[PDB]
Structure formats: C-alpha cells, structure tokens
Structure 1
Amino acid sequence: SRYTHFLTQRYDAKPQGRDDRYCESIMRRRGLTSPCKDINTFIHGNKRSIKAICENKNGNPHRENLRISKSSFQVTTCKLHGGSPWPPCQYRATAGFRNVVVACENGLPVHLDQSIFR
C-alpha cells in the first residue's frame, strides 16, 4: 500500500533521457502535479536493491528512524521551475548517482528523504 505508493512517487526502473522533458512527463504520469510538487527525486535501477536497504545487506541506520543505503543508485531530481502552483508544471532535471535515505515499514521502503538532494 505505502510501498506501492513509494514506488509510484519515487521509483522509475529504466528511464531513458532524464532531461527536463522527462521530469515534466513523469511528474504528470505519477500524479505529482496537483498541486505542482516543488521537488521530487526518482530512484532508478533494480527494485530488490532498494528493498535491500531495509536489511543489513544494503543499509545503515541514519538520523531518527531512517536508513541510508550502502550502495549508490542512479537518481533524477525534478525541480519545479517558474512557480506554477497547478498544471502545467515545468521542471528542471538533475541526474546524479549516490546513496539514498529511506524509511522502512514491514521490510519495505515507504518514504524517501528529499533533503539529501538539495
């Protein structure tokens, strides 16, 4: 439930571009444009690795009740451009590659900490 919603909001397995136009498309596809979300980051790659963050084989405890990954992931950060509060929402894409901070419930990721992505 919260896991499927995490994936919806935060996981794109195999993107192609990761350019501005990619962000604008996926923010709409995934229902993050009512209202226009200020910033959102998607994790790429394989799903079992992200699940693994909630175990000891890919995660460490972090701050208050979070977990931070041992391995790095391809990520894309979509940053709202030009103050649109409601659609059409315009976005600027920054691709990166780093470890990720999540929260886990019942051994599955359910929240992504945006703050590590500026």
Structure 2
Amino acid sequence: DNSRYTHFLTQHYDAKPQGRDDRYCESIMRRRGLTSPCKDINTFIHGNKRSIKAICENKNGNPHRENLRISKSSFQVTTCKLHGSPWPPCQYRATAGFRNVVVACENGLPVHLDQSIFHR
C-alpha cells in the first residue's frame, strides 16, 4: 500500500541537512543504505514534506509528460554522484542545487523522484 512513498522519503528526503559537502553525501548514502551496491547518482530534497507532497496536486505542481509531475516551487537540493567499482568503499561527490523537481505521485504522494534532471 502506501509505503513506496515511505521508501521515497527514505531515498530522497533529508529535512534539515548539516552542510552539503562530499563528506555529507558519503555519510547519508550509507545511513540510508544505498551502498550495496553503490547507487550511481542520488538526490535528496530538503525543507519540509508539506511542500514535496503538494507537487501531487495543482497546488504545487502541474503534470509533466507521461506519468510524471513537476513542481511550481524550487527546492534546496543535493545530488550525490559516485566516483570510480559499484561496491563500497562507496564515496561520491556532492552538488548543491536549487530548482524545481520532477516526481511521480501515486494516491497523491511522491513515490518516485526522477534523476535525469541532475546529470544536467
């Protein structure tokens, strides 16, 4: 049921981050168990869930292509990209960003963040 959202908070939300350097990334990847094997690129949104959820309604997001929503507002964000062996030690590099994000909502909740916009 409503858990893919839970999985989504766990992979793509860190409410209040303490600085956003590479040493940051390496930490939170591990904590959030994205290290076996090493996830090649992952992004975390910051701030509150309030906003993130509202991408799922015309409140803070209009539709976007086929099965995907985009937000009206911009999010502080941090993208961790692995450097090097898909296996730990898995120690990525960090890119702080600020811009709107794209997700799929189901039963009105974010349940997929779309990483394509963060290679760019």
* TM-score normalised over the length of structure 2: 0.95
Q: Which runs of 5+ in 2 are unaligned?
A: none
Q: Deviations over 1:22-73 (max 9, x none)?
A: 0000000001001001100000001110000001010010011100000000
Structure 1 residues 59-109: Cα deviation after superposition (integer angstroms, max 9, x where no partner) = 01001110000000001000001x231111011000000000000010100
The within-5 A match list for 1:1-118 is 1-81=3-83, 83-117=84-118, 118=120
In structure 1, C-alpha distance between the alignment counterparts of 2:19 and 2:112, rounded to whole Å: 25
- Structure number with higher strand proportion: 1
| Number of equivalences | 117
Contact 1:73–1:98 under 8 Å retained in 2:
yes
* C-alpha distance in 2 between matches for 1:5 and 1:85: 21
Say whether the 8 Å CA contact 1:84–1:90 is kept in structure 2. no
Q: Is the 8 A contact 1:51 1:108 kept in 2?
A: yes
Percent identity for Structure 1 against Structure 2: 99
Distance in 1 (CA, whole Å) between partners of 2:47 and 2:16 is 6
Structure 1 unaligned spans of 5+: none
